[PDB]
Symmetry: D2
Subunit: 289 residues, 4 copies
């Protein structure tokens, strides 16, 4: 079954689904091997592994190539955190076609104003992309896909930006009506109130995706009770990697020896297995004289 | 001081120097922050993070771009594990110019036959690149660099391939005479005998670089006693990352919650700091109205 | 009707087919609008447009990227001249998988030693890739396609390398038996004698592709008579482009004016048409608020 | 003499300078061999050769990559038409840093709204990027160059956008004050009236670059009289290339022969020369065993 279809089924299923963040081919393979039915191509993680910020410093094609390697290394669908589509509807649909061709299952586009044009840090709510413009962007992507199952998730930034439930609902409905396959409802809060308020008002007009990072103490059954469709574990592999690399690097730096890390890290043979080195060995014996 | 010069000084200094493996921009930054004077752009790690094998599946330009991101994220020199130069002398010197332009400090080229043309698994020693050909490849790289301090490290595979000290010495001397800035003498052994045998016979004709991965129990002072110039901690950040990602992924998969990983990984704010998010914030306040 | 299938039908059709060289997205669209049923992604042309030599200087992914834009800009199949596959069978199949993914219809691989290991130029015949190695490379490529109709064309370098017909025949049969969709038989003669000799000895064991650049005075019907499946017009758009650019640049350099070129070149409106600018104009009208 | 410096001296020289458009490594080398002291990395040409529209469809890194091959194939400075910098000041400076690193000598940024947010076509004058935003973008670019001589040219869209001379002057002064090495003043008229009006009001506050594509009948000496620093021949190699490719492809399509093109296009030997194939031949002789 196509990865696009796999993701689409997840978004539309009656069960709470989960997708795990991965930021490179290696990361993607590990997530797949763990049993996750889906991968979250975190915009934060992809940019951070590259050493750059998540402000579209890396080009959209550079992001796409990272995801191409991720897609090549996984059988489960990857939902790409594509920010706002890297431009207008045209850049978004072009991105969609490229993701589609590389095997990526869907793209998550957010209704934030892009790029940042001013710098005002008052208490005001932050203006977002015009609703009709973003709805038309969603429509353009849906209209441009060649795989009817490719998914477009519309991330509503109303709560994050300082607006309220009414703005969140209006945007969610506009994007869902524009054809979004799911709505990712997000919040900056350390509790699930925004999510709760939205789900109550949403009346299940379509699948809802959430990112519990800040309110991670919330019992997962509470999301099920609310009919949430999918949970995204957004950036934990990247955060775990940094801890390990920082710890491993300092230890070696301090010891000028490998004695205190050798027993704490996977073997090199485990690395070869993750690269599927044996498939190549077999291939070499078959295709080389 | 230029990164090339930084690396060159390290190779020629009277002290045992160390460089730590890094496989992406994030990794490179962490190694730098830890205090390492140099970074080892591991061929194994770069390919593995991409989810592919270390058999030049990723193109040389794809490797170069990974290193471009690494170089952009570090001030210390990166010595790239460039396998055999991805082709003949011409591909090697072209690679050298691109690495040079991206800020990479040096390239390590090995005298293995590339690409693998046959598959015979007998006990015979494995044939390597013709000595004159490889020496000429080294010469071409040295002759093509526009930065006189860019470094070319010649990795001698004689011991690994099954040949002995005499072949290792002959190759080392030929490459050193061809202008190699240092000789990386490697072995597959779980003890330092090959390294010991070579250093005894080498009579310090030039800097020697080693990779203690398999004989990591060896006391580091023993390398100093032998006059080794540099130690490469080859792949430990990649191996540490995989352990963390595998552990973190399984935990979340099992718990369907973040409660058991949140306290074990770096915060998201630590990720922003590694991306130098504050420099951008400052820049936005200065360059945006 | 996938491009792969289109190219495959052309190779297996009963008529002499023709593919025109193109080296970028722009020339690919022009070749298509001209009515050509196929495009030749020339190694000489693609490397030349980039300003590098045709010796694997640009990486295979940079080449694939050029081909991606060409594929996007054309509805007809593109057959890429992929040298030897940029490495061994593994590099070759990964290349095929990437070309498939981007809409490229086929790849032409040649059996020469790669990369160059020595510079001896004595009159001797140049050694080629080991017949079995290359045959297995072809098989590895066929075995790894996800699209059954993707085409692998095997170019035999025997005549060019100095070997005779026997060796040209041996290699071709070997590559055909390995699964090549067609054999590209080439020679460095200014006459079609190597081709006539091979076609006679071949005995229609498979579609044969030729490049008549050097023996261009040979009537095309002669190729139909020999039962040649396809002809490649290998590099004339690149050569024509260079002539035009040199003359135009020279004219402007000398005149310090555009007066003597403006009437000899396409208008800017034609460029916009070739870019399909109007489609975007239409899309903005539909997808951007008023 | 770095390319950056070369381009900068041209912008600040007392003579009317000229840069020829090129869109790939091949045309860049041709422009150079013709004697042009500079190259115009046209946004129209680069996007067109790729077969896409000039609306930021190809990513900035794909554009930079094309420019990298162009830089490698030329010894004279290339001024890249970088639209608006592909985003805000941050995307613009990262672009400048990458262009510097690859040998590109300068970047031309324009003050139009990017990307397009709406499709209203009422007669109204089109709004542009906020003058302060763009000025700060220019400054951010100047502030981030590692090479002091890298050039930032600011293209003013006021006349084209429907605004008058006052606004064209306001923007230009603003961008010049921010540190632009030159101002590219453009108009969509078939006469140089907008340029004459601006040059008169400008009062030589800085080098001015123009593109006389639309008013090409205007004597070039007239631009010298106005004190114009540089002229850009914006897209004639691309236009000439398209003419040549269409004719050549058509000729071959109709004749199913190369007979009527072989004598009208450059020989293959000229392509090898342009690729500098002989240098590689010489290098192999020296670096490959016998």
């Amino acid at each position: 079954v196509k990865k696009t279809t796999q993701l689409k089924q997840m978004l539309n299923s009656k069960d709470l689904e989960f997708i795990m963040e991965a930021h490179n081919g290696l990361s993607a393979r590990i997530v797949q091997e763990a049993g996750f039915k889906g991968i979250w191509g975190s915009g934060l993680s992809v940019s951070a592994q590259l050493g750059v910020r998540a402000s579209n410093e890396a080009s959209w094609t550079q992001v796409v190539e990272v995801l191409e390697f991720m897609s090549d290394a996984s059988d489960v669908p990857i939902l790409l955190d594509a920010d706002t589509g890297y431009g207008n509807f045209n850049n978004a649909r072009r991105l969609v076609r490229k993701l589609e061709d590389r095997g990526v299952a869907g793209a998550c586009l957010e209704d934030k104003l892009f790029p940042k044009t001013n710098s005002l840090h008052d208490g005001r709510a932050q203006p977002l992309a015009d609703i009709e413009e973003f709805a038309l962007k969603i429509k353009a992507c849906k209209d441009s896909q060649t795989d009817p199952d490719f998914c477009i998730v519309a991330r509503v930034e109303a709560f994050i930006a300082g607006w309220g439930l009414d703005e969140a609902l209006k945007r969610a409905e506009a994007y869902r009506n524009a054809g979004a396959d799911a709505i990712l409802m997000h919040s900056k809060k350390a509790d699930p109130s925004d999510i709760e308020a939205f789900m109550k008002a949403w009346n299940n007009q379509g699948p809802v995706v959430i990112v519990p990072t800040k309110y991670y103490k919330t019992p997962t059954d509470h999301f099920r009770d609310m009919g949430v469709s999918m949970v995204i574990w957004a950036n934990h592999n990247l955060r775990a990697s940094v801890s390990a690399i920082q710890q491993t690097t300092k230890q070696i730096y301090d010891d000028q020896s490998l004695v205190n890390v050798e027993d704490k890290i996977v073997s090199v043979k485990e690395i070869f297995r993750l690269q599927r080195d044996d498939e190549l060995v077999q291939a070499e014996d078959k295709y080389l004289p």
